């Protein structure tokens with residue numbers, strides 16, 4: 378056997394790390410100085426197509442270990458995004474019910490994805506407070522809470538970090554998007570403990586998992602530049618990524634440019650957190666950057 | 673560990689469907705009947721067509737048909753076009769997809785993003801005219817090449833050398849292989865490999881009912897039979913209606929958490945039919961089935977929400 382699993386759950390993580398030879402400022406070492414390489418960590422190769430499969434599964438497992446979750450329990454989560462899809466897949470497979478709590482004016486598209494994965498939906502007028510109230514009514518109802526759960530960070534410490542170090546011992550920069558901050562905090566803390574002078578770079582446009590002393594830089598990124606980079610990535614490297622990867626790529630190229638102009642070697646790992654599919658029903662990929670920007 | 677996205681192809685997971693299998697666990701009263709899902713959406717562009725796409729280009733290079741700034745013409749608007757657009761671009765070729773004017777903007781939009789140029793042929797003439805147009809275009813110079821996925825032995829060979837060996841490696845106990853029939857490459861290549869290496873293996877095609885299309889699949893009575901097709905390879909063919917394909921697609925994501933496209937519903941319907949028969953006969957079975965692509969591109973089609981009649 379090489380890739381035989383008894384459950385979809387076991388096929389989580391161990392995602393490919395792929396060299397971006399065209400988009401890299403300098404892939405080859407040569408006459409004008411050392412290489413500056415970009416390496417995409419493809420987190421859309423997870424069961425539900427996003428990096429949130431990692432925290433989702435570890436949150437549930439940690440809750441089981443701590444005695445919070447038991448055979449017929451229900452999981453409550455205030456989300457309408459990748460975490461809810463991830464939790465819906467994982468909950469169901471592990472024997473739990475999942476209720477997602479979201480605003481009444483959440484997009485039908487988001488809502489319908491959750492429902493197809495078997496999540497029940499409760500609408501709030503706020504979403505977080507109402508999940509916590511719902512959860513408090515029943516000892517068998519549990520809110521995992523992605524924004525404050527250390528199992529989120531741990532999933533990257535124990536999974537994303539190690540995998541990167543294993544595939545890229547020469548790593549000089551890790552770049553990722555800042556949401557719950559679990560990817561940056563978990564991966565960042567692991568890489569700092571192992572790679573001597575590694576830089577941890579956030580791409581964005583106090584979080585409860587945040588640590589003031591992990592991040593070495595933070596890059597803010599506008600939507601036009603995010604879209605621009607997302608289209609560039611698919612046209613030049615064949616990778617069809619979501620909109621947060623556009624932010625991450627803009628930042629990684631800025632870092633790469635820095636290393637190129639300073640005549641230093643870089644091996645920059647960048648997170649591709651999901652694929653472009655869920656974002657099609659918008660302008661991001663077809664037409665004008667302005668139409669996309671409005672989407 | 674990959675220098676190119678092209679290298680992150682194949683070696684896809686095989687995952688047991690413990691809930692949907694007719695009987696996952698052997699009992700004192702009967703042996704197991706297991707379903708194993710081969711997840712071909714874990715490829716570069718999210719489908720099984722990455723395999724033949726890349727092999728067809730490389731075989732063309734081997735044969736001296738393709739060189740640096742050549743143009744590939746393919747009469748396709750589906751997954752093969754997406755896959756050829758990605759591979760072609762990474763390998764330094766231009767890709768032009770020829771399709772009927774009638775083609776969905778949803779379909780066109782995918783090919784455009786990946787960098788394909790699009791040529792529209794007449795709606796009335798369908799794919800036959802699209803193919804003729806591709807071929808007439810390719811004839812206008814020696815540097816313009818049509819790969820022709822319905823007749824290209826590299827399509828078959830990509831499964832004979834990839835899909836088949838991977839399956840045997842992960843599932844030496846395989847009794848049945850089930851996949852949808854489109855170009856026939858998957859069935860023809862995987863099926864030939866498996867028949868050569870696994871005594872008494874059954875190769876089962878899933879096809880649409882005449883007149884009831886299932887995306888990416890072809891009924892061979894209704895349609896042109898691909899030149900790749902060898903009828904001797906199959907042990908069985910199952911026709912599947914649109915409603916059965918859709919209900920199984922939904923069932924798969926609800927029960928196993930795998931969000932697959934509609935051809936996979938048809939494959940699952942056939943696999944469960946083969947499984948139900950093994951179970952009734954008291955036979956042991958390990959049934960590998962292809963999950964050829966993910967549900968994402970199909971969600972605009974109402975096939976995942978609302979009533980089965982509407983879908």
Ligand code: NA
Pocket residue numbers: 512513514515516517518519
């Ligand atoms: Na509770």
